[PDB]
Amino acid sequence: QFRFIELNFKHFMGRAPLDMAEMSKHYEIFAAGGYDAEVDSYFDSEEYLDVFGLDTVPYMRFRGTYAPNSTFNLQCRLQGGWARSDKKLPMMSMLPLNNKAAIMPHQIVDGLPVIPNSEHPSQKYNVPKVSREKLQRELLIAQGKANALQIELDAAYTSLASSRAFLAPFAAMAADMDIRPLYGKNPQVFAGQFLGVGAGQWGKTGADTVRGRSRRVAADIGVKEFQLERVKQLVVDLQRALALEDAEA
Amino acid sequence: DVVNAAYPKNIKNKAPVISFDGKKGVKLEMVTLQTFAGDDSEDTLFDYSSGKFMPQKPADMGIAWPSGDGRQAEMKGGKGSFNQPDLRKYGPFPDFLKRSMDL
Amino acid sequence: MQDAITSVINAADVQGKYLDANSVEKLRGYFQTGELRVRAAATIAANAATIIKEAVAKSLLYSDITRPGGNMYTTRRYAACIRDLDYYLRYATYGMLAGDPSILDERVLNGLKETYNSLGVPIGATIQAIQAMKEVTGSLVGSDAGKEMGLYFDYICSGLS
Amino acid sequence: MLDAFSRVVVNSDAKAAYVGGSDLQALKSFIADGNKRLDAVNSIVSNASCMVSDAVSGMICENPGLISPGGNCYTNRRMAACLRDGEIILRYVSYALLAGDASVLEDRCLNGLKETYIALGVPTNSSIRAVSIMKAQAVAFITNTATERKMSFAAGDCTSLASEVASYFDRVGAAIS
Amino acid sequence: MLDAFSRVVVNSDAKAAYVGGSDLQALKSFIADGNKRLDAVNSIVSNASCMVSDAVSGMICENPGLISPGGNCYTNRRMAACLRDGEIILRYVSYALLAGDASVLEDRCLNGLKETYIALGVPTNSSIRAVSIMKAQAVAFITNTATERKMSFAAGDCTSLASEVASYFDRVGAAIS
Amino acid sequence: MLDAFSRVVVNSDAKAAYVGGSDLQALKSFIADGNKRLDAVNSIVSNASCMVSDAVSGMICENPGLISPGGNCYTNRRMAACLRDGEIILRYVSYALLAGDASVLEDRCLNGLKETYIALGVPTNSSIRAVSIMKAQAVAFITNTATERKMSFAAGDCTSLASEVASYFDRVGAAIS
Amino acid sequence: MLDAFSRVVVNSDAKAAYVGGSDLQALKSFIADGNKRLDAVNSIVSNASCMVSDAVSGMICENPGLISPGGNCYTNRRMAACLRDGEIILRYVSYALLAGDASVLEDRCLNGLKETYIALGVPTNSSIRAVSIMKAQAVAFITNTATERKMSFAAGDCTSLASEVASYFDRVGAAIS
Amino acid sequence: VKLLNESGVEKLVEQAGPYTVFAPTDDAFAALLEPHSFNKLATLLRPENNDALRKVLMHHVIPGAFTSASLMDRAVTVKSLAGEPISIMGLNKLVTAGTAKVVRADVPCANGCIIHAVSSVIIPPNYVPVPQPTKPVFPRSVIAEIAKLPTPRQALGLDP
Numbered sequence A: 001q002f003r004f005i006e007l008n009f010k011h012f013m014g015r016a017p018l019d020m021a022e023m024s025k026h027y028e029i030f031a032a033g034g035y036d037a038e039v040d041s042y043f044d045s046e047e048y049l050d051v052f053g054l055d056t057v058p059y060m061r062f063r064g065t066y067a068p069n070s071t072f073n074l075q076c077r078l079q080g081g082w083a084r085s086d087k088k089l090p091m092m093s094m095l096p097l098n099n100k101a102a103i104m105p106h107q108i109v110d111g112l113p114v115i116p117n118s119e120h121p122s123q124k125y126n127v128p129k130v131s132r133e134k135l136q137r138e139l140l141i142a143q144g145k146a147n148a149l150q151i152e153l154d155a156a157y158t159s160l161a162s163s164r165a166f167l168a169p170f171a172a173m174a175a176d177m178d179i180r181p182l183y184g185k186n187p188q189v190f191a192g193q194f195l196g197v198g199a200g201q202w203g204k205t206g207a208d209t210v211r212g213r214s215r216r217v218a219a220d221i222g223v224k225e226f227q228l229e230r231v232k233q234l235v236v237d238l239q240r241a242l243a244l245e246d247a248e249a
Numbered sequence B: 001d002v003v004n005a006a007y008p009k010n011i012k013n014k015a016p017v018i019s020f021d022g023k024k025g026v027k028l029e030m031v032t033l034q035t036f037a038g039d040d041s042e043d044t045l046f047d048y049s050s051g052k053f054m055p056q057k058p059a060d061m062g063i064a065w066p067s068g069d070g071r072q073a074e075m076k077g078g079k080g081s082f083n084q085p086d087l088r089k090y091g092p093f094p095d096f097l098k099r100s101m102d103l
Numbered sequence C: 001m002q003d004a005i006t007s008v009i010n011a012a013d014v015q016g017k018y019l020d021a022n023s024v025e026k027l028r029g030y031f032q033t034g035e036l037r038v039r040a041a042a043t044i045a046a047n048a049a050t051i052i053k054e055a056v057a058k059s060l061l062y063s064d065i066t067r068p069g070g071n072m073y074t075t076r077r078y079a080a081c082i083r084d085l086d087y088y089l090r091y092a093t094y095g096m097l098a099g100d101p102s103i104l105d106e107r108v109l110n111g112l113k114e115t116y117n118s119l120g121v122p123i124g125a126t127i128q129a130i131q132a133m134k135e136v137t138g139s140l141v142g143s144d145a146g147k148e149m150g151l152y153f154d155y156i157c158s159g160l161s
Numbered sequence D, E, F, G: 001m002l003d004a005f006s007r008v009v010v011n012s013d014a015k016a017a018y019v020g021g022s023d024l025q026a027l028k029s030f031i032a033d034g035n036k037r038l039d040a041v042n043s044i045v046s047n048a049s050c051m052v053s054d055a056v057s058g059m060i061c062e063n064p065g066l067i068s069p070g071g072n073c074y075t076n077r078r079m080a081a082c083l084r085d086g087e088i089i090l091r092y093v094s095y096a097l098l099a100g101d102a103s104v105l106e107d108r109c110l111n112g113l114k115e116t117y118i119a120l121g122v123p124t125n126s127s128i129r130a131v132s133i134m135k136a137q138a139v140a141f142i143t144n145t146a147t148e149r150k151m152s153f154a155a156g157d158c159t160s161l162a163s164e165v166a167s168y169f170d171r172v173g174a175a176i177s
Numbered sequence H: 001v002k003l004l005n006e007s008g009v010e011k012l013v014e015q016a017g018p019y020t021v022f023a024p025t026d027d028a029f030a031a032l033l034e035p036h037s038f039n040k041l042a043t044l045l046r047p048e049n050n051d052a053l054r055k056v057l058m059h060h061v062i063p064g065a066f067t068s069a070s071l072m073d074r075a076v077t078v079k080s081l082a083g084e085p086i087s088i089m090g091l092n093k094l095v096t097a098g099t100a101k102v103v104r105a106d107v108p109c110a111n112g113c114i115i116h117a118v119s120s121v122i123i124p125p126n127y128v129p130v131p132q133p134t135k136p137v138f139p140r141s142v143i144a145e146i147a148k149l150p151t152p153r154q155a156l157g158l159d160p
């Protein structure tokens, strides 16, 4: 019965339960009139006809705004993977909706549709078939390599905060000076190359052409933090195989 | 070697954990009960490295310098025709660090 | 101080051998890349000041060695850096032409890490200054030429470590 | 959701007690300063479009890797969904400033937000220093000390409303940490 | 009602299988000397962690070369794997003591073990040394003749079940020989 | 003690934030249970001044010939040295519990210990009793099942940390047997 | 025993010289700050009975095995002796801060105290922790930054006398280590 | 040497200045499991607290070359390269550095530097241990705090 109320939000509305209050309403609609009263609660709703209307087949909805945030993680847990059926799966949503069991981040990646470009493309198929003891060792290290990389990214943020306080007596002291250039602003003066910028000198980004003590420690942050992001997914697909090391076990 | 098909993927499942909770029924569970693990292997499945990397230095060739003239350590393939051998030996020396054949 | 074609005239020769097919096989491999190395050393000579200006602004300014108390504070100390980084970009150019890193440890690496510890120069920031300098050098000379010039930068970074 | 008066009822419901006379002394001083609370959320909602563009584009000033290729604020679908998310956080902070209690922020916005951002590939450290620019913007708009826009208020002291909306913003950064 | 155990054990389904009240007296009438036998497995599994950490260590206390560098109870993953294997045989003896048959202990836990321990290089004489300690404990816990502990039981005799738990432990040592 | 985890360096002029070439992967993955481990070493070393006096007097009251004249703990030089060897063993177990491997135990403490005691005439059959009391003492603290002292903790499980520290105490006792 | 005057006597006796004008400036500056030193001892003596109960009980709440049976603060004779040697050590430090040289601290207080505490079986780890709570009080009383008792002193500086009494308690803690 | 290499302090004692290191043998580090000293030092085992680890290791470096023969019944203090004073006291051939109780007398080093082996780890004087990582807690309600603030009519005794 607990699995039957789960799928009716997915098969008919195309989402999860928003919270435990909306899910416990539908056990009272079943308690009043049974199956066909509970089934007609979705098709006779204003949320149905404002989205699907009378003409569209229902689908799993990926909108943007999600008035509980925890219902986004639950709909990716419920509808996850293109080749996955609902036959003989266990019940998934009572313990996320009561904040008992957190949804693991690899179970949301199975629910999301696949983009072409990631920053860190996944090793979902590129993990080798090693044992449970080496794979657990493989996953723990990925979390371990997020912990020392986090506390040297925090040391980079304290150096950015120290670099701005170093120059803040002069950054505000030059903010009420009259700095008039010789060219570049009005078009009646010959500026040459600096009508805009000339011939390839804009850069790959635009912020790399700006010099300064706080721009130079910021590029240290982006090389220290992109690495952290890529390692976060390495503990995701180490964990996810763990789900299939255990779920099939 | 994995000869363990006789121990299948229901391996360390540990059926007989039994909790009586009074005078009432046994209450048999199925808990796997993992160890104080650690699974010690080297060279795991991914890189786990940030750029912060220049650790590589060559091997010590003795007193010469590294990568130092070990044309004694390097291969080579020919000898010549009129080479004739030596009487005294004074056996194998080191790398004669300074001054390579092109001093 | 040996180049490629002069390291094979030690190995084919310190044991007293001749130049067989294997010794000439590597020599032909060096002559094939002879055209690539000169153009690599060409542009590096042109953009010597620009490369060093790009490396320091991309890596070691940004971190309180540049500020007071840091290892690079005074103008004499700052000026010693770009003088110091010029040798790494220059001697790496020599290794890229000679095709053999023997000149680096002969004239750069020996007594180098033992000297920075005396002065108290941070070896950690130095390697970053060379890694960033290696990154911009791959911009100019291209990919494979950057692979060649980059192969001697980390040789300096390895031994200097 | 709860507000400031539903919060004191569920404390009194825990002991099955009536809301008496001594705890009505503090509720009457909440409603006496209720005109400063409406005068404070009006200084945030009036400035709310420039608050999430000073903050998201100030997050890029401290991280150029977001606008590098592959980055999180790189393409136009990804910058639009970050400027969307920065004003959802400003919307639920202003709800809890209006309601007097942070219960609508903790379960409708901040619950499950961290592991949402792991799964999409969002850098959570860049969100913490994005919502901390909006924290410093809000406490400059409450206390009328922004440098480019001054508003016209009556005379007095709104420092307790400034550190109540500051504590709603370091409750966000404790959830995505 | 014995199949619902077996369903949990052999059929790998339902996990707890926790016998209620009216299902209990049908089991006690079905199992001969059931009030002694349900005290017999209660005297084992309430002292389960105390019996393992003797029996793994008492193997090392008589054979000290296993924790030498080069021995098999060196390298802490291998020392913990010996303690899990000592815990598994202690459990699966007690299900054979509960169900009254060595059939479920043989196929699930014991078939192929002799080929397993010679495939990993496990010294198979010391495993008989380890289970002889667990053979010596379980006759002492059932008869309430344990040294530092004594249990409060209903009075009587349990020597017939103590011989029955002697006939389960040597079947392990007859298999891994 | 301070080698038992791996911290991270973030400032300049370090030589390890840039050129160090390695985060310690086997020690970056031991803070992944590290709050549970640091509470477990905090159970022992906040009771180690009571653990060594209970264990040494445990073997005196179980074998009264050691405080006999002619016994090995009669003189005040010998009674002070027997209390010193129990604390030093209990610290190096608490190294190996903290570091997670028994390499530091078998290098500084256990290497050349059986040859020491048979050269000094120290009885080895009584000395392993004093370690095995501390084996039974340390599992009561980590599982928090000690009788006359409990400690406040966070809610959870600490098996296979009491079972880890039982794997070091017999490793002491078999190296001196 | 010696003091701050007779220390530079026996240093000038070693060079066989007279106490000339280059060494009287070490003494005439010492007497010019003589009123500061007498105001520095009076912060200790006026709180001498409550500092020893502040420090021995702080050793107990950090190391609770001393009050367990088998400990070393268990009985009333053992507790009152531990309140005795907290203040006997404080008696000689207050002499050595008054005299200006640690000769009285290293010939009466520390005159074989490490040989005493071994032969008494006193845990030396807990006594280094006591002594040092009295060090952390004395640098708060001399600098008048104790959190709960302020004494009225004329303004100025006592960082020299605070660092002098911090070197007398470390000397005690170096020798009973 | 391993803590120096990780913590970045090892660059400092690479320098040519005449130092007097009081490097503790690892039995001293192994002796850090005192119920007392584990309170104030265990928190450094966390991987983010490299900050205090430099400040506790830098207390062992003394500017100058103080050999034990130079401490013939002399008590002289000095501050470290950490920044806080330490009292080296040599009397009765028992040279002390705070709570050191030096084991091995001296080791001659490269730049005229000396190395003494100590029995324990010297903690700096005004060093407070870093607190454990905690939970950022936020006020459950807003009306439990307006009720927690005394009004002006309360401060004058006009009300209870």
Ligand SMILES: *C(=C)C1=C(C)[C@@H](Cc2[nH]c(/C=C3N=C(/C=C4\NC(=O)[C@H](C)[C@H]4CC)C(C)=C\3CCC(=O)O)c(CCC(=O)O)c2C)NC1=O
Pocket: D047, D049, D050, D051, D054, D057, D058, D061, D132, D133, D136, D137, D140, D141, D145, D146, D147, D148, D149
């Ligand atoms: C790079 C080019 C770049 C930055 C760096 C970053 C600068 C920055 N600014 C703040 C603070 C504010 N932004 C504010 C917003 C506005 N000011 C206005 O008056 C209008 C209404 C509005 C814009 C539409 C405000 C009010 C502040 C507060 C300061 C003040 O008192 O004026 C920060 C926050 C500091 C922190 O991290 O805590 C930063 C870094 N913006 C860039 O574009």
Ligand SMILES: *C(=C)C1=C(C)[C@@H](Cc2[nH]c(/C=C3N=C(/C=C4\NC(=O)[C@H](C)[C@H]4CC)C(C)=C\3CCC(=O)O)c(CCC(=O)O)c2C)NC1=O
Pocket: E148, F047, F050, F051, F054, F055, F057, F058, F059, F061, F062, F133, F136, F137, F140, F141, F145, F146, F147, F148, F149, G068, G069, G070
């Ligand atoms: C003499 C005949 C004799 C003793 C002396 C005494 C020593 C002893 N104690 C145990 C078992 C434990 N000892 C423990 C230690 C302590 N308990 C405390 O509360 C304080 C902190 C500390 C002593 C200062 C603990 C926790 C145990 C475990 C049992 C329990 O929970 O109490 C033994 C071993 C006995 C065994 O393993 O069965 C010995 C020898 N006992 C004596 O008989």
Ligand SMILES: *C(=C)C1=C(C)[C@@H](Cc2[nH]c(/C=C3N=C(/C=C4\NC(=O)[C@H](C)[C@H]4CC)C(C)=C\3CCC(=O)O)c(CCC(=O)O)c2C)NC1=O
Pocket: G047, G050, G051, G053, G054, G055, G057, G058, G059, G061, G062, G133, G136, G137, G140, G145, G146, G147, G148, G149
């Ligand atoms: C137990 C867990 C525990 C304690 C008991 C307590 C003991 C303690 N106190 C300090 C610091 C000081 N102790 C002082 C002593 C006293 N205060 C007084 O004014 C009188 C003389 C006496 C009490 C009768 C003083 C003056 C200080 C300095 C600060 C101040 O202004 O009070 C310590 C050392 C610091 C520390 O490690 O906490 C200890 C152990 N603290 C406990 O944790």
Ligand SMILES: *[C@@H](C)[C@H]1/C(=C/C2=NC(=C\c3[nH]c(C[C@H]4NC(=O)C(C=C)=C4C)c(C)c3CCC(=O)O)/C(CCC(=O)O)=C2C)NC(=O)[C@@H]1C
Pocket: D032, D033, D035, D036, D038, D039, D040, D042, D142, D143, D144, D153, D154, D155, D156, D157, D158, D161
């Ligand atoms: C702190 C945030 C400010 C500040 C606040 C004050 N506002 C005061 C009075 C006030 N504000 C409003 C308008 C407000 N009420 C509404 O109904 C709406 C929108 C529909 C808004 C924006 C009113 C009506 C009042 C007057 C109430 C009254 O005087 O009775 C005020 C005066 C004292 C008080 O009301 O308690 C203060 C201090 N002023 C500041 O200086 C900072 C910047």
Ligand SMILES: *[C@H](C)[C@H]1/C(=C/C2=NC(=C\c3[nH]c(C[C@H]4NC(=O)C(C=C)=C4C)c(C)c3CCC(=O)O)/C(CCC(=O)O)=C2C)NC(=O)[C@@H]1C
Pocket: B020, B022, B023, B024, B025, E028, E033, E034, E035, E036, E037, E038, E039, E040, E042, E043, E142, E143, E144, E153, E154, E155, E156, E157, E158
């Ligand atoms: C053998 C190991 C023991 C022993 C066993 C006996 N127990 C007897 C009666 C009895 N046993 C239990 C516990 C057991 N029965 C249950 O139903 C459950 C679970 C719900 C358990 C754990 C109970 C409750 C009783 C009844 C006691 C009473 O009436 O108060 C018993 C008597 C004969 C019999 O009933 O079979 C024996 C011999 N006694 C021993 O002497 C050894 C050490």
Ligand SMILES: *[C@H](C)[C@H]1/C(=C/C2=NC(=C\c3[nH]c(C[C@H]4NC(=O)C(C=C)=C4C)c(C)c3CCC(=O)O)/C(CCC(=O)O)=C2C)NC(=O)[C@@H]1C
Pocket: B002, B004, B007, B011, B012, B013, B014, E056, E066, E072, E073, E077, E078, E079, E081, E082, E083, E085, E086, E088, E108, E109, E113, E116, E120, E122, E123, E124, E126, E127, E130
């Ligand atoms: C311990 C007292 C022994 C000893 C034990 C070791 N066993 C190791 C691995 C292992 N053992 C089993 C059989 C056991 N596990 C089960 O799940 C069940 C039944 C339910 C039983 C009886 C298995 C399946 C395995 C794992 C084999 C595999 O994964 O392929 C082991 C580890 C070997 C290693 O990692 O090098 C040890 C050390 N060895 C001893 O020295 C004493 C005598």
Ligand SMILES: *[C@H](C)[C@H]1/C(=C/C2=NC(=C\c3[nH]c(C[C@H]4NC(=O)C(C=C)=C4C)c(C)c3CCC(=O)O)/C(CCC(=O)O)=C2C)NC(=O)[C@@H]1C
Pocket: F056, F072, F073, F077, F078, F079, F081, F082, F083, F085, F086, F088, F089, F108, F109, F113, F116, F120, F122, F123, F126, F127, F130
């Ligand atoms: C007490 C539970 C024992 C016992 C202890 C005695 N040990 C004696 C001397 C001794 N013990 C050790 C080993 C200890 N020192 C270490 O440094 C380490 C590990 C790092 C350990 C485990 C050594 C090296 C020595 C000799 C030097 C010394 O005196 O410390 C001893 C004195 C013997 C004598 O002087 O006649 C005793 C009494 N002996 C016992 O009977 C119980 C079982």
Ligand SMILES: *[C@H](C)[C@H]1/C(=C/C2=NC(=C\c3[nH]c(C[C@H]4NC(=O)C(C=C)=C4C)c(C)c3CCC(=O)O)/C(CCC(=O)O)=C2C)NC(=O)[C@@H]1C
Pocket: G056, G066, G072, G073, G077, G078, G079, G081, G082, G083, G084, G085, G086, G088, G089, G108, G109, G110, G111, G113, G116, G120, G122, G123, G126, G127, G130
């Ligand atoms: C308390 C903070 C300690 C601790 C102290 C105990 N001391 C015991 C006896 C005792 N204490 C001293 C120290 C003291 N007396 C002096 O004359 C001097 C300086 C010259 C000092 C520092 C001495 C010498 C003695 C032996 C005296 C005697 O008992 O005749 C004692 C009781 C032992 C007993 O009654 O036999 C205790 C408990 N013990 C602790 O646990 C903390 C660390």
Ligand SMILES: *[C@H](C)[C@H]1/C(=C/C2=NC(=C\c3[nH]c(C[C@H]4NC(=O)C(C=C)=C4C)c(C)c3CCC(=O)O)/C(CCC(=O)O)=C2C)NC(=O)[C@@H]1C
Pocket: F033, F034, F035, F036, F038, F039, F040, F042, F043, F142, F143, F144, F153, F154, F155, F156, F157, F158, F161, H042, H043, H044, H046, H132, H133
């Ligand atoms: C095992 C013997 C205990 C037990 C352990 C748990 N501790 C848990 C969390 C926890 N413990 C500490 C203190 C510890 N961490 C440190 O960094 C230091 C010293 C500097 C110490 C002593 C902290 C700070 C935390 C985190 C608090 C929190 O976030 O809740 C814990 C839960 C987390 C986990 O399992 O990983 C457990 C189970 N608890 C027990 O019941 C047994 C007896």
Ligand SMILES: C=CC1=C(C)[C@@H](Cc2[nH]c(/C=C3N=C(/C=C4\NC(=O)[C@H](C)[C@H]4CC)C(C)=C\3CCC(=O)O)c(CCC(=O)O)c2C)NC1=O
Pocket: A062, A063, A064, A065, A066, A067, A068, A069, A072, D056, D066, D072, D073, D077, D078, D079, D081, D082, D083, D085, D086, D088, D089, D108, D109, D113, D116, D120, D122, D123, D124, D126, D127, D130
């Ligand atoms: C209830 C509250 C609530 C929220 C807080 C947001 C949370 C949120 N953000 C995104 C989605 C996203 N969020 C970001 C955000 C960022 N990348 C960055 O550079 C910054 C650090 C950061 C914010 C400025 C991006 C870039 C996406 C789109 C992912 C992509 O297509 O690349 C999604 C997935 C939406 C979808 O695609 O359907 C959700 C649920 N939504 C909510 O309903």
Ligand SMILES: C=CC1=C(C)[C@@H](Cc2[nH]c(/C=C3N=C(/C=C4\NC(=O)[C@H](C)[C@H]4CC)C(C)=C\3CCC(=O)O)c(CCC(=O)O)c2C)NC1=O
Pocket: E047, E048, E049, E050, E051, E053, E054, E055, E057, E058, E061, E132, E133, E136, E137, E138, E139, E140, E141, E145, E146, E147, E148, E149, F132, F170
């Ligand atoms: C949970 C609490 C609990 C215990 C601690 C043990 C205690 C215990 N140990 C043994 C019995 C034993 N116990 C051990 C274990 C050890 N002996 C040694 O040599 C070392 C001191 C130690 C390993 C460290 C051994 C080796 C035997 C004897 C087994 C044999 O007959 O060979 C017996 C059986 C005696 C009898 O049945 O009458 C008992 C009750 N049992 C328990 O129920």
Ligand SMILES: C=CC1=C(C)[C@@H](Cc2[nH]c(/C=C3N=C(/C=C4\NC(=O)[C@H](C)[C@H]4CC)C(C)=C\3CCC(=O)O)c(CCC(=O)O)c2C)NC1=O
Pocket: G032, G033, G035, G036, G038, G039, G040, G042, G142, G143, G144, G153, G154, G155, G156, G157, G158, G161
């Ligand atoms: C018979 C007993 C006896 C004493 C108790 C002292 C009493 C005493 N203290 C000071 C005087 C002083 N005492 C201090 C000391 C301090 N002030 C501070 O702010 C610090 C907290 C603390 C440092 C330890 C200072 C700074 C002076 C004044 C300067 C000086 O005398 O050198 C003076 C000189 C000024 C005066 O006349 O009051 C005297 C007599 N001398 C004695 O003969």
Ligand SMILES: CCC1=C(C)/C(=C/C2=NC(=C\c3[nH]c(/C=C4\NC(=O)[C@H](C)[C@H]4CC)c(C)c3CCC(=O)O)/C(CCC(=O)O)=C2C)NC1=O
Pocket: A210, A211, A212, A213, C057, C061, C066, C067, C073, C074, C075, C078
């Ligand atoms: C105490 C002696 C001393 C000096 C002088 C010093 C200068 C110094 N000037 C710098 C940058 C800079 N300096 C300027 C300066 C100027 N632009 C102009 O148009 C003007 C002509 C001129 C100032 C009057 C600029 C624009 C930068 C940043 C350059 C860049 O970002 O590429 C930097 C790099 C960033 C930093 O760490 O601050 C240093 C170290 N350091 C020292 O230790």
